[PDB]
Ligand binder design. Structure first.
Ligand SMILES: Nc1ncnc2c1ncn2[C@@H]1O[C@H](COP(=O)(O)OP(=O)(O)OP(=O)(O)O)[C@@H](O)[C@H]1O
Ligand SMILES: Nc1ncnc2c1ncn2[C@@H]1O[C@H](COP(=O)(O)OP(=O)(O)OP(=O)(O)O)[C@@H](O)[C@H]1O
Ligand SMILES: Nc1ncnc2c1ncn2[C@@H]1O[C@H](COP(=O)(O)OP(=O)(O)OP(=O)(O)O)[C@@H](O)[C@H]1O
Ligand SMILES: [Mg+2]
Ligand SMILES: [Mg+2]
Ligand SMILES: [Mg+2]
Lengths: 527, 186, 95, 252
C-alpha cells in the first residue's frame, strides 16, 4: 500500500492528462486487490511504474536568446548556414508564441559534412536534452513500438525510454541514418516511423506497452540521410528536408585552420610552436589531396601530419618540426591530384567539356578523328564507356551536326560521307549524362571544318535535335573545375543563369560567361 | 485553412506578415505542383517563420511578401518553363504526357539524317520505352500509307532517312499515347 | 447540420462527403445505427486520415484511431487466451 | 539474497558511470520484489549478470617505450615498414598525450602478406588484449547489435562479448574481411568516432564507451567496402614481396 503513496508522490509534481490519470487509478485499484507475490501483481506494478516515470507535462527550460544561440552554433561548425538559419527561425517562432514547439527536420548531403554533430550543437544551443537514435540497419519494429504487457519481458520502446531518460517531454531526438532503415522480415520499421513522424498524429502516438497515447508534438526530430530517393515517399513527405551541401576549397581551408588543426593538436598534445601548419601548406594539401566534398579525409591528413611530427619530436630526432610545401610529401606521401588539364593546346578535332564528379568537378575532352582515308554513307563510332544516355546524345549531336554543316556550308560533305570515330579519354572511367551534347556537336564541326576551337573555352549543355540548348545540372562543380583548369571563357545554357548566379562571388570572379539559347550562339562563340 | 493555422502556430498577426492571393497563386504554380498538400503547408510555414525571424531580430516591424521577393523567402523556383517551343518549326508537334508533379507536355522532334530526300529508315532516340518505340514504328507505317494515298507523288517518307527525337533525353518515357503526335510530326 | 460540419473542416473532398451523406440518408430511412466498411486510398497528403475525425463529428459517433502500419502481432487484433498471466482482449475490445 | 551481494561485489573495483549505476541499482531494487521461480526474475538475473560483467573503467597497462615495442615488432615480422611506422606513431602520440587512445586502421593487401599475424604482434607489443571478429559472410545485424531482452534468447552482440572476455575497455579488435560482408550499417555506429564513444546495444540498453578500442580491419580489395564505411577508416597498404624479400623472410 506504501507503493501507492510513492506513485502518488511521483505523479503529483506532473501535469498528468485525464485519460492517463484514469488508467493509473484503475491499475492502482487492480494492484490493491492483488496480493504481493502473484505474477500479475509484478506485471501491474511494472506497468504502473512505467506510467509513473514518464515526464507528463514537464519541459526543459529551452533557451530563447538569439545571440547566445548563434554563438553556441558558431562554436563548433563553419559554413552550415542553412541549418543555422533554420534553428534561428525556430527560436524566433518559439519566442513569438508563448510555448515551446516541436518540428521534424532532416539533414541530407554527402558524407563528412557534419550532419551528426550539428545535431548535438543544436541541442546544446537550445538547452534541450539530446538523444541519438541510430536506426541505420535496424529491422526490429519492436524498438519503436515495443510489446504488450502479456509478454514476459516487454518494454515500451526507444522513444518512451528517451522520454523517461531525459525526464523532459521536449527533447531532441536524432534519428541517425534514416535512409539506411532495414526492410527486414520482422516488420517494416519505416511504416512505424510514418506515425512517429506524422506532424498531426504526434499528439496521439500510441505505444504498445503503455497502450496510452503520448504527446510527442513538442519533440524536435532530426533525421540524417546520405541519399534522399531511398526514403519511402509517405515518410519523405512528412519531413522538412534541407540540404547540407559540400564545402569548397576556400571553405575547407577555413574549416581546417579554425577547427580541425586546434582539435587535432589537443588530441595529439602538441603545442602550436612545436609543429606549425601554415596556411599555404594547408591550401596545397587541400588542393592536391582533399578534392572530396567531405571533411573526414582532410582531418585524417592533418592527423597524419601531426602524429608524424609528434613521433619526430618525442624520439629526439628534432626539437621542432617545420612543415613546408616542399617537404609536405615526406609526411603525407605522393600527391593524388597533379594534372588538371589534358590538352594545353587543342588540335582541330577536340573540344574541352566539363563533367560532374564526386571529388569536385572535372573536365573531359571529346576527341574525334577520321577512321578511313577518304572523306554508301558516313558513320560514327563512339568509345569511352559511354552510357546509353550518352550514346543517344552522341547520335542526336551527329544528326544535328550533319544538318548544321549542310545548312551553313553546303559544299562541305565531310559529315555526310566520312567515317568518324569519337572517343572520350580516361577510357577506364564510365561516364553518363546528356551534358556533353553541345561539346560533341562542336567537336564534330571543328573536325569537319579543320578549325581548332578557342584555346581556353569550355562548354556544357544538352542539345536537342533542332539545335536548342537545354539546361543541365551540376553547375557549381563544373564551374569550379573550369576555374581550376585555367578556363577563361565558359558557355552555359541560358536556363542555368539562376543556378550560375546563385554561386558564391569568389567562385565566378575570373570567368567570362556566355548564356546561349540555341547552338548557333555557341558556334559564333567558339569560332 | 493552411494560412490561418500556420499564423496561429507561428503567432504572427495578419498585419505583421501579409500573404496575398496572387503571391500564393505564384507560389503554388512555381513550387507546389504535386497532388498533395503537405509541401504547400511547409512552404507557407517557411515564409511565415522567415517573416517572424525578420520581425524578432529588429530587422523590420512589417514584412510584405511581394511576388518579386518571394525568392528571398523560398529560394529557386522549381518549375519555370512551361513549353519548349513558342512557335513550332515544321518538324515538331506538341504533345501531352502524364507526370506525378501535375501535367506535363512533350514535343516530338524529327529531322533528316542524310541529305537526299534503297529504302527509308527511322531512328528513334529519347530513352523511349518499348511500347512507345513500337508505337513509333506503327506511326511510321501509317504515315507512309497516309501520305501514299493523300499525295501519290510524295516520296519523302518512303526513301528519306529520318531521325525522331523526344527532348529531355535523360527522362525515361513510355506509353502509346503519342502515336498521333508522331504521325503528325512525320 | 452534417453537411455544415463536414464543410467547415475540409475543402473539396466531394466524393467522401457525398458518401457520408448517402450513409446518413440510408441510416435515416430505417431507424437503426447502420455500420459499414470504407477504404480511402490516394496520394499522400490529400486528407484521408484527417477527414476521419470530421466524419465522426458529423455522425456524432465516438472516434478511435488504430494504426496498423508495420504491425506484425496478431495479438493486437485478437488478444490472448485468458489463461496467460497478462492477457488483454486486443485493440478492438479495448476500444 | 546472496546473488545481490554477488552482483554488488563486482562493482567494488570498477568505476561505474552514473547512467550505468542508475540502471544497475534500479534492477537491484527490482530484483528483491520478484520470486525466484518467475521468468521475469530469470531475465533480470541475466541482465544484472551482463551489466556487472562489463569491465567499466578497466584499462590494460600499455607499455609506451618505443625501443621495447620496436624490438618486439622486428622480432616477429620483416619489412612491413608502413605498419610499424604507424604503430610507432600511435605509441608516440599516446606517450605525448599521457593517456591511452583508440584508432581505426585498415591493413589491406594481397593474401599471405601477414596482416592477421602483424595485428597479433601489435597486440602483443602494445600489451593490449586481442580478439578475433570474423565479419566475412556475416549477414544479420544481431551479431553486432543483439536482440531486445524480451525475447527468450538474447545477445549483447559480439562487441559486448569481446568486452566481457578481454576484461578491458581498450583491447585490440581484429575485424577481418570487411570487403566480404553481406548488415554494414551496424558497423558505422561501431566505428564512427562521433558516436563510437556512446555505442548503444539493443540488449544492454545502455551505451558503452569504445573510444579507447583499437580497431584493426583487414581486407583484400578496397573498392568493395561501402563508401560511408570506407570513409571512417584509415587505409594502410601492405605491399607484396619481391624475390629478395621473400628469400630474407624464408631464411629468417
Ligand atoms: N563545417 C564544419 N565545421 C567543423 N567541423 C566540421 C564541419 N563539417 C564537418 N566537421 C567535422 O567533420 C567530422 C564529420 O563527422 P559527422 O559525423 O558530423 O559527419 P556526417 O557527414 O554527418 O556523417 P555521416 O552522415 O556519415 O554520419 C566531424 O569530426 C565534424 O566535427
Ligand atoms: N481538403 C483539405 N482541406 C484542408 N486541409 C486539408 C485538406 N486535405 C488535407 N488537409 C490538411 O493537410 C494535412 C494532411 O494530413 P493527413 O493526415 O490528412 O494526410 P493523409 O492525406 O491522410 O496522408 P498520409 O497518406 O501520408 O497518411 C493535414 O494538416 C490536413 O488538415
Ligand atoms: N614479413 C613477414 N615476416 C614473417 N612472416 C611473415 C611475414 N609476412 C607474412 N608472414 C607469414 O605468412 C603467413 C601469412 O599468414 P596470415 O594469416 O597473417 O596472412 P594474411 O595475408 O593476413 O591472410 P588473410 O588475407 O587470409 O587474412 C604467416 O605464417 C605469417 O607468419
Ligand atoms: Mg551520423
Ligand atoms: Mg494517414
Ligand atoms: Mg585475416
Amino acid at each position: 500500500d506504501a507503493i501507492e503513496e510513492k506513485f502518488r508522490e511521483r505523479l503529483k509534481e506532473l501535469v498528468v492528462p485525464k485519460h492517463v490519470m484514469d488508467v493509473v487509478d484503475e491499475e492502482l485499484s487492480k494492484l490493491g486487490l492483488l496480493d504481493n507475490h502473484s505474477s500479475e501483481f509484478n506485471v501491474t506494478r511494472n506497468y504502473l511504474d512505467w506510467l509513473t516515470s514518464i515526464p507528463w507535462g514537464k519541459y526543459s527550460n529551452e533557451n530563447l536568446d538569439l545571440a547566445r544561440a548563434q554563438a553556441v552554433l558558431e562554436e563548433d561548425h563553419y559554413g552550415m548556414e542553412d541549418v543555422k538559419k533554420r534553428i534561428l527561425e525556430f527560436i524566433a517562432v518559439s519566442q513569438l508564441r508563448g510555448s515551446t514547439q516541436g518540428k521534424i527536420l532532416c539533414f541530407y548531403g554527402p558524407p563528412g559534412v557534419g550532419k551528426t554533430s550539428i545535431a548535438r550543437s543544436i541541442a546544446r544551443a537550445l538547452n534541450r536534452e539530446y538523444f541519438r537514435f541510430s536506426v541505420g540497419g535496424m529491422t526490429d519494429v519492436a524498438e519503436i513500438k515495443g510489446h504488450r504487457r502479456t509478454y514476459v519481458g516487454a518494454m515500451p520502446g526507444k522513444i518512451i525510454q528517451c522520454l523517461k531518460k531525459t525526464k523532459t517531454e521536449n527533447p531532441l531526438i536524432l534519428i541517425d541514418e534514416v535512409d539506411k532503415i532495414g526492410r527486414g522480415y520482422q516488420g517494416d520499421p519505416s511504416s512505424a516511423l510514418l506515425e512517429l513522424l506524422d506532424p498531426e498524429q504526434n499528439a496521439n502516438f500510441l505505444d504498445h506497452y503503455l497502450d496510452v497515447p503520448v504527446d510527442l508534438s513538442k519533440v524536435l526530430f532530426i533525421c540524417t540521410a546520405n541519399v534522399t530517393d531511398t526514403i519511402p515517399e509517405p515518410l519523405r513527405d512528412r519531413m522538412e528536408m534541407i540540404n547540407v551541401s559540400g564545402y569548397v576549397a576556400q571553405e575547407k581551408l577555413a574549416i581546417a585552420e579554425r577547427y580541425l588543426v586546434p582539435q587535432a593538436r589537443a588530441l595529439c598534445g602538441l603545442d602550436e610552436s612545436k609543429a606549425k601548419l601554415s596556411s599555404d601548406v594547408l591550401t596545397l594539401l587541400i588542393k592536391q589531396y582533399c578534392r572530396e566534398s567531405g571533411v573526414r579525409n582532410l582531418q585524417k591528413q592533418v592527423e597524419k601530419v601531426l602524429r608524424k611530427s609528434a613521433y619526430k619530436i618525442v624520439s629526439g630526432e628534432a626539437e621542432s618540426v617545420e612543415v613546408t610545401p616542399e617537404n609536405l610529401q615526406d609526411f603525407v606521401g605522393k600527391p593524388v591530384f597533379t594534372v588538371e588539364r589534358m590538352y594545353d593546346v587543342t588540335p582541330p578535332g577536340v573540344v574541352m567539356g566539363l563533367a560532374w564528379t564526386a571529388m569536385g568537378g572535372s573536365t573531359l575532352f571529346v576527341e574525334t578523328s577520321l577512321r578511313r582515308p577518304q572523306d554508301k554513307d558516313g558513320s560514327l563510332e563512339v568509345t569511352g564507356q559511354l552510357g546509353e544516355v550518352m550514346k543517344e546524345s552522341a547520335r542526336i549531336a551527329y544528326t544535328f551536326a550533319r544538318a548544321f554543316l549542310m545548312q551553313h556550308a553546303p559544299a562541305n560533305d565531310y559529315l555526310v560521307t566520312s567515317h568518324i570515330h569519337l572517343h572520350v579519354p580516361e577510357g577506364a572511367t564510365p561516364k553518363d549524362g546528356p551534358s556533353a551534347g553541345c561539346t560533341i556537336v562542336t567537336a564534330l564541326l571543328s573536325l569537319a571544318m579543320g578549325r581548332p576551337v578557342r584555346q581556353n573555352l569550355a562548354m556544357t549543355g544538352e542539345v536537342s535535335l533542332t539545335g536548342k540548348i537545354l539546361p543541365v545540372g551540376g553547375i557549381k562543380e563544373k564551374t569550379i573545375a573550369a576555374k581550376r583548369a585555367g578556363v577563361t571563357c565558359i558557355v552555359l545554357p541560358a536556363e542555368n543563369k539562376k543556378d550560375f548566379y546563385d554561386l558564391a562571388a569568389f567562385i565566378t570572379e575570373g570567368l567570362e560567361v556566355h548564356f546561349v539559347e540555341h547552338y548557333r550562339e555557341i558556334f559564333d562563340i567558339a569560332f
